[PDB]
Amino acid sequence: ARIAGINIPDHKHAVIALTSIYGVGKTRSKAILAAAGIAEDVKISELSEGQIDTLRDEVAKFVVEGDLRREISMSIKRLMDLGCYRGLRHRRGLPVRGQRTKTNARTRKGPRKP
Amino acid sequence: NPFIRFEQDKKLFRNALEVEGLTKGFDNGPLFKNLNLLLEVGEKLAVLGTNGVGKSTLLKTLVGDLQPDSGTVKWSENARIGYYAQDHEYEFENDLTVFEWMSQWKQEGDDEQAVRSILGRLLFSQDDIKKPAKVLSGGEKGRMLFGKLMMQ
Amino acid sequence: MRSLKKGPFIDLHLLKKVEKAVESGDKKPLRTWSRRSTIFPNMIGLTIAVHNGRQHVPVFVTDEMVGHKLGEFAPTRTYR
Amino acid sequence: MKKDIHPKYEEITASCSCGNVMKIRSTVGHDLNLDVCSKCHPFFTGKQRDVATGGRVDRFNKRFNI
Amino acid sequence: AKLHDYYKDEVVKKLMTEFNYNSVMQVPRVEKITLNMGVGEAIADKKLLDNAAADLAAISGQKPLITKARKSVAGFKIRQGYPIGCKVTLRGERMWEFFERLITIAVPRIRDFRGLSAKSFDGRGNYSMGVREQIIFPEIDYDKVDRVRGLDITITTTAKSDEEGRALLAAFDFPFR
RNA sequence: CCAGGGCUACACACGUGCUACAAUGGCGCAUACAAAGAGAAGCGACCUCGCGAGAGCAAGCGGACCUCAUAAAGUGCGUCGUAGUCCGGAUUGGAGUCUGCAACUCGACUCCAUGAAGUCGGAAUCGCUAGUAAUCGUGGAUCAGAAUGCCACGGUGAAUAC
Ligand SMILES: Nc1ncnc2c1ncn2[C@@H]1O[C@H](COP(=O)(O)OP(=O)(O)OP(=O)(O)O)[C@@H](O)[C@H]1O
Ligand SMILES: [Mg+2]
Ligand SMILES: [Mg+2]
Ligand SMILES: [Mg+2]
Ligand SMILES: [Mg+2]
């Protein structure tokens, strides 16, 4: 239907349709449906507007697409400009949890370039 | 020699299409009754008919010419289809010039340079770029249809 | 001390040393070999010097650096 | 004007979520409801409340359970 | 219009008392509002200029004029006659209506509202402003849009001083700093 | 002799492995069947608490009885219908638990969110002839904490040898 950012996917189970929201995964999507009184098996298409209306406000209790990306970028910016270790690792594009960079860490470094 | 080169945009996998229920007839009766076929990706079909057995209307149904008995015609998901129907007249029943007519489908990233190089590759000249579309020969219209199949 | 049940950690030598400093405020940079100790909000405005292995580098304290352990602000290994 | 070359311009009644009835002309033709306009916008408190993130001193002190 | 009668009723008195005028026809008044977009690139996609003109016409119900390159500047590969942008000039009733329906609903829709700067003046009392995007107007419904094209608005008034131009737009409840 | 750091550094290359790229599968509910092995500043039931790692009181046993310890592939039912997908789980932000003087360099694990490459892999190359390969789980040594490695056990169980 239409939720905070956008809810494109109809024809999918509601419990797994709200997972297209940047901030709702699987355990929260299960919780929100139970809180709003909607079961899990019921498809989003079958949902009359008397249900999705309560879904557009339930997500307001969790930080979501509208603000979540701003906070994460702000969160990373705080460490990057701080000068601490995890800021330095972000600055160079290297692993920040303290793991091997001798051979692995293709995901963080990037594609294999000579 | 026309430097025709067809290039895919986003390739697909597994089944290209699935068609079941195929039954349709207009006057004499159902030309084909309950035709079942499945096409994997990369397949090439050669569906020849010999003058009036549905050899073109089956393709028209597959591309979309509705109301068959077939209720289970289905395409792939990211599917993009290019169509070359045997009637090039209707697509040129219009007073559009050749180049602007080719410019109905310049995709996001294609410019004047690309839309005109795709026909310059087809040895069409800017000499001829200013002529109305409905004045080209049968082979010239057919090759322009390839110049349209390239774009999509 | 990596649990709320135990409590935030600082070494005794550092804890008594910082207490004397705030008694007279900001002074000459504090040289310390402690890197395993958290940063308490009682030493905001100091320029303590941690030892990365070969030298003492001065780390400036700020309200933002109040939950990070001291060694975080001294790169121990050089690179390019 | 120049005899029907412009998009159609007619009076519409676009209202806000806080009421706010306005008689305006627009080239939409379908009534619109939207967020708060400048008639009731938080242009004096929307900025004073924006600074809320920042400061780990109080976060450390609330974690001081020991 | 509504804002026109608001002006003629009360802003005349406000500015007259604030600047000790002696004639009605001496108070500064808005004379035109010109909103344009320089699409930059149309040589690549000649139709994108058409779409930009359509966006501007949707924003303000007047068919835009397509303004073409003046001199063949060599930096960006253009020559004389190339269509470069589109422009709409609004006067009278349409001017007042667009001014009102901008300042009331279109301005607050900008992300991270701050309030428009007070130093955006040319020095003769004429204001200029950007939007950085056009979705903030109620006339775009997320269907044909492909780019994030914006506008450039110049409110040209008969004010003869920067201070008078400040006060004229201040008296209209402008979102200033 | 001691405090701190390095042995964990990263434009790259090679070797041994784990996880996958899904429909002879993913998830949810319910439920059968093992063998071997360990334990005294040790194994830790029961009950309560915590969404969970786990915390509290806390029986039993130096042991064919007490604990680890609910085995899993499977079976029955339901949904997902070929999508980078209810496949994949890296990476990253935040919130935590346990050892341990001490977890930043540099531990394991848990909760929420994010969701990368990957849609059967070039030349080439490895193992296996029967309870074998393949596939699924449990245990032990080392060990305060910390294995996809090492050592050992069982369940299902092939194709082919002219
Ligand atoms: N709309 C129609 N009305 C009447 N008869 C039709 C119609 N469409 C097709 N037919 C007839 O049905 C048969 C289907 O012929 P079809 O259109 O497939 O042509 P073809 O000769 O098989 O091939 P091609 O069109 O590719 O040259 C022909 O006998 C044709 O006359
Ligand atoms: Mg030592
Ligand atoms: Mg080593
Ligand atoms: Mg890929
Ligand atoms: Mg161990």
SS (H, E, C) chain A: CCCCCCCCCCCCEHHHCHHHCCCCCCHHHHHHHHHCCCCCCCECCCCCHHHHHHHHHHHHHCCCHHHHHHHHHHHHHHHHHHCCHHHHHHHHCCCCCCCCCCCCCHHHHCCCCC
For strands C49-51 and C31-32, give the pairing. parallel
**Is the CB of residue B55 below 6 angstroms from any atom belonging to ligand 1?**
yes
CA distance B68 to D40: 58
How far apart, in whole angstroms, are the C-alpha atoms of residue B130 and residue B96? 9
For ligand 1, atom 31: residue with the closest CA:
B52
The CA–C1' separation of A72 and F54, in angstroms, is: 29
Which tokens sit at E158? 């008969």
Residues C30, C37 contacting (CB under 8 angstroms)? no
**Cβ contacts of A80 within 8 Å, gap of 6 or more:** A87, A90, A91
**Which residues make beta-bridge pairs with D25?**
D11
Give the residue among A69, D38, D24 at the shortest CA–CA distance from E60.
D24
Question: Partners of D34 in the beta sheet?
Answer: D16
Q: Which fold would CATH assign to domain E1-177?
A: 50s Ribosomal Protein L5; Chain: A, (3.30.1440)
Question: Nearest nucleotide, C1' to the C-alpha of C35?
Answer: F104
Q: Measure Cα distances from B121 to B116, B126, D8 in Å.
A: 8, 12, 44
- Give the resolution in Å: 3.3
Are residues A47 and A38 in contact, defined by beta-carbon separation less than 8 angstroms? Answer: yes
Q: Is the CB of B51 under 6 A from ligand 1?
A: yes
Delimit the domains of chain E by residue range: 1-177
Using alpha carbons, list the distances in angstroms from residue E38 to B73, C64, E76.
48, 44, 13
Does residue A62 contact residue A24 with C-beta atoms inside 8 Å?
Answer: yes
Query: What is the C-alpha to C-alpha distance for residues B142 and B124, in angstroms, rounded to an integer?
Result: 13
Helix segments in B7-137, DSSP class H: 57-63, 98-102, 112-120
- Contact status, residue C49 vs residue C58, Cβ threshold 8 Å: yes
Q: Which residues contact E39 (CB under 8 A, 6 or more apart)?
A: E48, E49, E52, E84, E85, E86, E149
Whether B59 is in the pocket of ligand 1, judged by its Cβ within 6 Å, is no
Complete DSSP assignment for E75-89: TTT--TT-EEEEEEE
Instruction: Report which secondary-structure segment, H or E, holds D19.
Output: strand D19-21
Q: Which atom of ligand 1 is nearest to the CA of B57?
A: 18
Q: How far is the CA of B83 from the centre of ligand 1 (A)?
A: 18
Is residue D29 within 8 A of residue D23, CB to CB? The reply is: no
Q: How far apart are CA A31 and CA A29, in angstroms?
A: 5
Do residue D56 and residue C67 have CB atoms under 8 angstroms apart?
yes
Q: List the strands of the sheet with C31-32, edge to edge.
A: C31-32, C49-51, C56-58
**Cβ within 7 Å of strand F: which of C 38-67?**
51-54
Among all residues of chain B, which has the CA nearest to that of E147? B108
Q: Contact, E129 vs E117, CB < 8 A?
A: no
Picking from E93, E96, E119, E89, the residue whose alpha carbon sits closest to that of residue E172 is E96
Separation CA E83–CA E81 (nearest Å): 6
Instruction: Return d(Cα E63, Cα E61) in angstroms, integer.
Output: 7
DSSP H or E segment with residue E37: strand E30-38
* C-alpha closest to that of D35 among E100, E115, E107, E142: E107
DSSP letter at C29 equals P
DSSP B132: B
Q: Tell me the DSSP string of C57-80.
A: EE----TTSSSS-GGGGS--S---
C5 CB inside 7 Å of strand F: yes
Q: Which long-range contacts (C-beta less than 8 Å, at least 24 apart) are formed by E10-19? A: E11/E168, E11/E171, E11/E172, E14/E171, E15/E164, E15/E167, E15/E168, E15/E171, E18/E167, E19/E164, E19/E167
Residues 6+ apart with CB under 8 A from B89: none
- Positions 77-106 of A with beta carbon below 7 A from strand F are 79, 85-86, 89-90, 92, 94-103, 105
H-helix or E-strand spanning residue C22: helix C12-24
CA E141 to CA E134: how far, in whole Å?
A: 11
Is the separation of the CB atoms in C35 and C56 below 8 Å? no
Q: What's the half-sphere exposure (Cβ side, CA atoms, 13 Å) at C50?
A: 18
Of B47, B57, B59, B56, nearest to B24 by C-alpha is B57
Helices (H) and strands (E) in chain E, counts: 5, 5
Nearest 5 degrees, angle CA E125-CA E128-CA E129?
A: 150
Touching check for A88 and chain C: CB below 8 Å? Answer: yes
Long-range pairs, D13-21, Cβ under 8 A, ≥24: D14/E105, D14/E138, D16/D40, D16/E105
Backbone angles phi, psi at E137, to 5 degrees: -90, 150
DSSP state of B42: T
Last residue before each gap in chain D (C to N over 2.5 A): none
Cα of D6 to nearest chain C Cα, Å: 57
Instruction: Read off φ and ψ for residue C49, nearest 5 degrees.
Output: -120, 115
Question: If you compute the radius of gyration of chain A from its CA atoms, what whole number of angstroms results?
Answer: 19
SS3 percent helix, strand, coil of chain D, rounded to 5, is 10, 20, 70
Output the known binding site of B: 49-56
Shortest CA to C1' contact from A85: nucleotide: F104
- Token readout for E129 is 């402003």
Angstrom distance (rounded) from CA A74 to CA A79: 9
Q: Other CB atoms closer than 10 Å to residue A30's CB: what's the count?
A: 15
E60 closest CA partner among E9, E94, E37, E110:
E94
CA distance A109 to A113: 10
Q: Residue A114 C-alpha to ligand 4 middle, in angstroms?
A: 22
Q: Are B89 and B21 in contact (CB under 8 A)?
A: no
The Cα–Cα gap between E86 and A113 comes to 45
- The terminus-to-terminus CA distance of chain D in angstroms comes to 78
Q: Is B57 in the pocket of ligand 1 (CB under 6 A)?
A: yes
Using CB atoms, which chains have 3+ pairs under 8 A with A? C
Distance CA B20, CA B48 (A): 20
Exposure string of B1-29, with b = 16+ CB inside 10 Å and e = fewer, is eeeeeeeeeeeeeeeebebeebebeeeee
Burial of A80 (0-12, 13-18, 19+ CB in 10 A): middle
Q: What distance in Å separates the CA atoms of residue E4 and residue D52, rounded to the nearest whole number?
A: 41
- Other CB atoms within a 10 A radius of the CB of residue E109 amount to 16
